[PDB]
Every structure is written in C-alpha cells, then in structure tokens.
Design a protein around this motif. Structure first.
Motif, PDB file in Angstrom:
ATOM      1  N   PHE A 174      72.151  75.679 -15.956  1.00 11.84           N
ATOM      2  CA  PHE A 174      73.181  76.638 -16.304  1.00 11.84           C
ATOM      3  C   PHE A 174      72.870  77.258 -17.656  1.00 11.84           C
ATOM      4  N   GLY A 175      73.462  78.425 -17.900  1.00  4.24           N
ATOM      5  CA  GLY A 175      73.286  79.149 -19.133  1.00  4.24           C
ATOM      6  C   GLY A 175      74.563  79.175 -19.953  1.00  4.24           C
ATOM      7  N   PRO A 232      70.604  49.596 -15.662  1.00  4.19           N
ATOM      8  CA  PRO A 232      71.632  50.577 -16.046  1.00  4.19           C
ATOM      9  C   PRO A 232      72.070  51.492 -14.916  1.00  4.19           C
ATOM     10  N   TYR A 257      62.079  71.033 -25.442  1.00  4.34           N
ATOM     11  CA  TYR A 257      63.402  71.508 -25.062  1.00  4.34           C
ATOM     12  C   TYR A 257      64.336  70.318 -24.930  1.00  4.34           C
ATOM     13  N   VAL A 269      68.842  82.942 -29.837  1.00  4.42           N
ATOM     14  CA  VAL A 269      69.941  82.239 -30.485  1.00  4.42           C
ATOM     15  C   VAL A 269      69.471  81.088 -31.370  1.00  4.42           C
ATOM     16  N   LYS A 273      68.294  70.854 -20.350  1.00  4.11           N
ATOM     17  CA  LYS A 273      68.370  72.000 -19.460  1.00  4.11           C
ATOM     18  C   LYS A 273      69.183  73.095 -20.132  1.00  4.11           C
ATOM     19  N   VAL A 274      69.893  73.885 -19.339  1.00  3.56           N
ATOM     20  CA  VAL A 274      70.702  74.949 -19.900  1.00  3.56           C
ATOM     21  C   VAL A 274      69.822  76.062 -20.448  1.00  3.56           C
ATOM     22  N   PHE A 275      69.815  77.201 -19.767  1.00  2.00           N
ATOM     23  CA  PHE A 275      69.019  78.339 -20.204  1.00  2.00           C
ATOM     24  C   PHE A 275      69.455  78.731 -21.610  1.00  2.00           C
ATOM     25  N   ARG A 276      68.900  79.824 -22.123  1.00  4.20           N
ATOM     26  CA  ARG A 276      69.246  80.291 -23.459  1.00  4.20           C
ATOM     27  C   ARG A 276      68.301  81.391 -23.916  1.00  4.20           C
ATOM     28  N   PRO A 288      64.679  56.134 -14.044  1.00  2.95           N
ATOM     29  CA  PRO A 288      65.760  55.163 -14.322  1.00  2.95           C
ATOM     30  C   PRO A 288      65.283  53.724 -14.139  1.00  2.95           C
ATOM     31  N   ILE A 289      64.546  53.228 -15.130  1.00  5.36           N
ATOM     32  CA  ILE A 289      63.912  51.922 -15.017  1.00  5.36           C
ATOM     33  C   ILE A 289      64.831  50.839 -15.561  1.00  5.36           C
ATOM     34  N   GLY A 290      65.099  50.871 -16.863  1.00  4.60           N
ATOM     35  CA  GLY A 290      65.856  49.816 -17.507  1.00  4.60           C
ATOM     36  C   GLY A 290      64.981  48.977 -18.415  1.00  4.60           C
ATOM     37  N   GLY A 322      67.974  53.285 -20.515  1.00  8.42           N
ATOM     38  CA  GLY A 322      67.299  52.926 -19.284  1.00  8.42           C
ATOM     39  C   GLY A 322      66.568  54.056 -18.602  1.00  8.42           C
ATOM     40  N   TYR A 323      66.482  55.215 -19.246  1.00  9.22           N
ATOM     41  CA  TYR A 323      65.707  56.322 -18.724  1.00  9.22           C
ATOM     42  C   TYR A 323      64.489  56.513 -19.612  1.00  9.22           C
ATOM     43  N   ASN A 380      63.683  85.672 -22.862  1.00 14.00           N
ATOM     44  CA  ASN A 380      63.477  84.958 -21.617  1.00 14.00           C
ATOM     45  C   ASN A 380      63.971  83.525 -21.680  1.00 14.00           C
ATOM     46  N   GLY A 381      64.267  83.017 -22.866  1.00 17.54           N
ATOM     47  CA  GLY A 381      64.809  81.688 -22.994  1.00 17.54           C
ATOM     48  C   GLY A 381      63.827  80.642 -23.441  1.00 17.54           C
ATOM     49  N   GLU A 414      57.821  71.122 -22.304  1.00 20.89           N
ATOM     50  CA  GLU A 414      58.799  71.201 -21.228  1.00 20.89           C
ATOM     51  C   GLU A 414      58.929  69.877 -20.490  1.00 20.89           C
ATOM     52  N   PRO A 415      60.155  69.471 -20.157  1.00 24.42           N
ATOM     53  CA  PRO A 415      60.357  68.147 -19.553  1.00 24.42           C
ATOM     54  C   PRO A 415      59.677  68.020 -18.201  1.00 24.42           C
ATOM     55  N   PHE A 438      63.508  74.895 -14.562  1.00 23.28           N
ATOM     56  CA  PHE A 438      64.093  73.576 -14.735  1.00 23.28           C
ATOM     57  C   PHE A 438      65.472  73.655 -15.363  1.00 23.28           C
ATOM     58  N   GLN A 439      65.991  74.852 -15.619  1.00 25.15           N
ATOM     59  CA  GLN A 439      67.269  75.039 -16.284  1.00 25.15           C
ATOM     60  C   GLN A 439      68.351  75.257 -15.241  1.00 25.15           C
TER      61      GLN A 439
END
Ligand SMILES: *[C@@H]1O[C@H](CO)[C@@H](O[C@@H]2O[C@H](CO)[C@@H](O)[C@H](O)[C@H]2NC(C)=O)[C@H](O)[C@H]1NC(C)=O
Ligand SMILES: *[C@@H]1O[C@H](CO)[C@@H](O)[C@H](O)[C@H]1NC(C)=O
Ligand SMILES: *[C@@H]1O[C@H](CO)[C@@H](O)[C@H](O)[C@H]1NC(C)=O
Ligand SMILES: *[C@@H]1O[C@H](CO)[C@@H](O)[C@H](O)[C@H]1NC(C)=O
Ligand SMILES: *[C@@H]1O[C@H](CO)[C@@H](O)[C@H](O)[C@H]1NC(C)=O
Ligand SMILES: *[C@@H]1O[C@H](CO)[C@@H](O)[C@H](O)[C@H]1NC(C)=O
Lengths: 244, 209
Positions: free
Chosen positions: A221-222, A177, B12, B21, B15-18, B160-162, B133-134, B196-197, B154-155, A218-219
């Motif tokens: 964007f917010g 892929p 999680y 909410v 990504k993308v903080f937060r 990317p193997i396939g 494939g990930y 803190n997110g 947390e990740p 690891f983030q």
C-alpha cells in the motif's frame, strides 16, 4: 487406501501451514469424536507448533481404550496416551473397506509384553515372549508364545468386532513464535462506492478507484505526506487502487 | 585489514510505496563512514544484524551458516548454493570447524531433526537481521576493496524460524583443478524518495553538525 496396524502405527508430522479442521468436522459423519485439551468448536482461534497425526486400525470395542488413563491389551502393549493429553481422538467405521470375506489377516496387534508401554512409544520387535522360567532360545512351544496376533476381519461380524479407523491428532506448544495456525477470507471488490474494506489487514472506509501509479513489486500500500493510506494493491489480481 | 564504507547498507525499512518524501526513520543501520573488516574463513559474531558485501566473477562465496554453537545440541540455519541453486535448511547439524569431478560439500556431517527445508565484476550486498523469530534478508546485486556510491537494498526473504543466533561463518569453493563484514546499530536516518518510489539518497543524522 491402506492404514497401518496397531503395533506399528504411523505418525505424520504437519509443518507450519494453515490448518483447516472444517474439512473433517464438516465431513458430517465420522465416528467417535472427542476433544480433550481444546474444545471441538474453536480449533479456528488457537494454534500450535506442530500437530501429529497417528493412524491405525483397531477393533470396534477397543476404541474406548484410546483415551488418557485407560488399560487393556491396546492401551498397554500397542498405543498409550499420556494423562496430560492435549490433542483429540477421532474414529469411524471401515467395515466396507478393511474387511474381506474369508478373513483379512493383514492387521496385527501385540498381546504379550514384559511391561506396559510408555506414552507415545512404539515397539515393533518380534522376539518370542517367555512366560515361564525356562529359556526357549527363539522357538515357540511350551510357555513361549509369538507376541503378535491378528484380526480376522470378516463382513459378517458385529459392531464391536468390525474394523474401525482411528486418527489421533496431538498438538504441540514448545517455544516457537509463529507456527501452523488457522485461515482467513475473500469477498468481491466493488468500486466507486463508499465502502468498508479490509485488505489482508488494512481496515478502512472510502471509495475505491482504478489507479495509474506503479508500486515496486514488493510494496502493498501507499501512503501520503502526513501519513494516511491512499493506495492499496489487491492481493488476488495485484492491481493498484486509490482510496478516496 | 580494515576499510571504510562511504554510504552503504541502506535497505527499505518495509513495504508501503512512497515518492519524493524526505521520510525519517529509526531503525538498525550501518552508520556512514564505518570501520568494516576486510577478508581475503573464521567464526564471526552477529550481536545485531550484519552487512555483508563481496565481489568475484566466479562464485567463491557460496552462502553462510548461522547460529549460536554451529553444531548439535542446539539448532542452526544453513544457507547453501551449489552450481544448481539455493538450499535453505534448518536442522541440528555437525559442522566442520573449517567447512567448505566438481565434487564438494565437506560442510557438515549431520542433518538431524530438520524443522525447515527448502530447495529449488560483481558486487553482491546482503543485510541479515533476526527479530521476533523472523530472520529477514535484504540484498542487492550491483555490477562494476569496495568503491563509493549509493544503492538501497530490497527485501528478499522472511523465515519464521524462532532460532537463536550469536555467530555465523562463510562458505567458499576451494581450488582443486574478498569480503567485508559490518555491523548494525540503532540509528536515525533521513531517506529521500524518488517519484517512482525508490530511495536515491540518505542522511545519517549523527555524524557532524
Ligand atoms: C489468488 O487466486 C485467484 C483465483 O482463486 C487468482 O486469480 C487468477 O488470476 C489469473 C491472472 O494471472 C487469471 O488468469 C486466473 O483466471 C485467475 N483465477 C480465477 C479463478 O479467477 C489470483 O491470481 C491468486 N492470487 C495471486 C496473487 O496470484
Ligand atoms: C578500525 O578499528 C581498528 C581497531 O584497532 C583500528 O586499528 C583501525 O585504524 C580502524 N580503522 C579506521 C578506518 O578507522
Ligand atoms: C545441491 O545441494 C543440495 C543440498 O542438499 C542437494 O539437495 C542438491 O541435490 C544439490 N544439487 C544436485 C544437482 O545434486
Ligand atoms: C533431536 O534429535 C535427537 C537425536 O537424534 C533426539 O534424541 C531428539 O528426540 C530429537 N528432538 C525431538 C524433538 O524429537
Ligand atoms: C535465546 O537465548 C537466551 C539466552 O539469554 C534465552 O533466554 C532465550 O530463551 C533464547 N531464545 C528462545 C526463543 O528461547
Ligand atoms: C522512474 O523514474 C525516472 C526518473 O525519475 C522516470 O523518468 C521514469 O518515468 C520512472 N518510471 C519508469 C522508469 O518506469
């Protein structure tokens, strides 16, 4: 510093990375440069599973035989390309490197074989070729020849008998892929001006300002409530910037 | 034996903080109050992601092995850890049907065609999933049969193997001188984000009224 002989050519396989063809194409000179399956210009928008790089040194007037559907002492017994080739061949001259006065006898090639080689097959055996109907049992003589000759490269040769260094790239698309593909960009980051920005994928417009929030490491964007991007992290320096 | 998770296996989604909410997501999660196998080892299925916890001050759990056939004729992943450090690897192998001084490694007997390499009490949770494939891996290490609490994962990695996957196993360090397996389904959750997110609480929106 040392290339391989034709009969035993090298094969380096390139893993999943970023492929910069603009280092070899920009190099300026470089002899023969013929692409076949892909066009020479847009190696920077297509990409494949693995690319192979084969290296050897042949004569000058044998470079025309590194091409699909050719015949000769090199395209039959030494190195064969399939007619459905999808990489590209490139070759340049190396007379000032691979040639010595008195003779450079370290580059061999095969010229006697029972049958033509198959595409991308390698044969490094040194058994005695038998031309007649009599066995010879492992000793040269009448109607039995040693199969490997050798180029006696000298600097006082003509173009066509001088050494040329050949590198053949071949591309591979089996089923994977995401694989080795081309590259990206950079640009300085300005602040306090309505700007058009592109963060490793995040495309937007606005004023950028120094932040005082703290992402988790690891983030990228917010986002706000109602889901609009309002902060980013600069990939190179790793600092948070608000987007107004 | 079998046991009951309480609120376990939250990761999680990206990504993308937060911050504060109560954000709503649809994804593959381990449903609350689930039926998780207990092991004190065999070929399991995969079928859609996996939750996997464990506990032990020593290190008996020494990685997993994945794939469809766990042998040659098709490709598989191998994730190992000797007393040195992690060794991810992707070849075609020949795996012992029961694979496992301080001399070791009767795990496989073949390492052909390698297409990816890499080298370098306690509760250790992991979430394994495999999309487009990930092969994604989330993880968390919280120190003290499971207990009861909330802790988001947390990740860690992205490969990317396939590779195709239908089965997996475990690896253990023998004696010469406890682990669980949940499965993931498409659920809808409501995650509460701290200032803190970090995810501090959640709601599984398909349990009761
Ligand atoms: C991307 O590369 C740039 C340089 O090309 C890195 O910038 C360096 O950042 C460190 C800070 O830790 C400075 O000490 C160096 O002087 C910087 N180098 C230059 C040439 O300015 C940047 O850190 C890289 N990106 C990441 C994420 O590390
Ligand atoms: C889990 O499922 C098995 C299937 O037979 C059942 O016997 C067991 O009681 C279940 N456990 C719980 C906690 O519901
Ligand atoms: C740990 O295992 C890996 C698996 O190949 C191996 O490469 C490494 O050498 C091992 N560690 C030591 C100290 O040998
Ligand atoms: C995988 O290994 C087998 C046996 O070693 C070999 O026949 C086959 O060519 C290999 N795969 C590739 C793509 O070369
Ligand atoms: C995984 O197995 C399925 C079997 O239904 C097959 O169709 C599919 O092509 C395999 N994956 C890849 C990437 O080839
Ligand atoms: C993290 O959150 C706590 C409580 O929500 C807060 O007191 C602290 O300032 C935050 N930031 C840290 C610990 O860096």
């Amino acid at each position: 510093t040392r290339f391989a002989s034709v009969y035993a050519w090298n094969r380096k396989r390139i893993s999943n990375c970023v492929a910069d063809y603009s280092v070899l194409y920009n190099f300026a000179p470089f002899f023969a440069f013929k692409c076949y399956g892909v066009s020479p210009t847009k190696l920077n928008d297509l990409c494949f599973t693995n690319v192979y790089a084969d290296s050897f040194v042949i004569r000058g007037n044998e470079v025309s035989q590194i091409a699909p559907g050719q015949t000769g002492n090199i395209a039959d017994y030494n190195y064969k390309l399939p007619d459905d080739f999808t990489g590209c061949v490139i070759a340049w001259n190396s007379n000032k490197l691979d040639s010595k006065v008195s003779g450079n006898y370290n580059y061999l090639y095969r010229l006697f074989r029972k049958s033509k080689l198959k595409p991308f097959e390698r044969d490094i055996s040194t058994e005695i070729y038998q031309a007649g109907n009599k066995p010879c049992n492992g000793v040269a003589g009448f109607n039995c020849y040693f199969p490997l000759q050798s180029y006696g490269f000298r600097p006082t040769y003509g173009v066509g008998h001088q050494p040329y260094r050949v590198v053949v790239l071949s591309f591979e698309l089996l089923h994977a892929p995401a694989t080795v593909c081309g590259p990206k960009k950079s640009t300085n980051l300005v602040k306090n001006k309505c700007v058009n920005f592109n963060f490793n994928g995040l495309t937007g417009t606005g004023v950028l300002t120094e932040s005082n929030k703290k992402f988790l490491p690891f983030q990228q964007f917010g986002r706000d409530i109602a889901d609009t991007t309002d902060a980013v992290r600069d990939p190179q320096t790793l600092e948070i910037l608000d987007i107004t | 034996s079998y046991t009951n998770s309480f609120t376990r296996g939250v990761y999680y989604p990206d990504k993308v903080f937060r911050s504060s909410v109560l954000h709503s997501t649809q994804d593959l999660f381990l449903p609350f109050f689930s039926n998780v196998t207990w092991f004190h080892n065999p070929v399991l299925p995969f079928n859609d992601g996996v939750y996997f916890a464990s506990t032990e001050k020593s290190n008996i759990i020494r990685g997993w092995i994945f794939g469809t056939t766990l042998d040659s004729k098709t490709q598989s992943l191998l994730i190992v850890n000797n007393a040195t450090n992690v060794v991810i690897k992707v070849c075609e192998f020949q795996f012992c049907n029961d694979p496992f001084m301080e001399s070791e490694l009767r795990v496989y007997s073949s390492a052909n065609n390698c297409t990816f390499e890499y080298v370098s009490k306690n509760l250790r949770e992991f979430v394994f999933k495999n999309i487009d494939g990930y092969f994604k891996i989330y993880s968390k290490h919280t120190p003290v049969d499971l207990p009861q609490g909330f802790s988001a994962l947390e990740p860690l990695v992205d490969l990317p193997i396939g590779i195709n996957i239908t089965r997996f196993q475990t690896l253990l360090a023998l004696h010469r001188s406890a682990y669980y397996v949940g499965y993931l389904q498409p659920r809808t959750f409501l995650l509460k984000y701290n200032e803190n997110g970090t995810i501090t609480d959640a709601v599984d929106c398909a349990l009761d009224p």
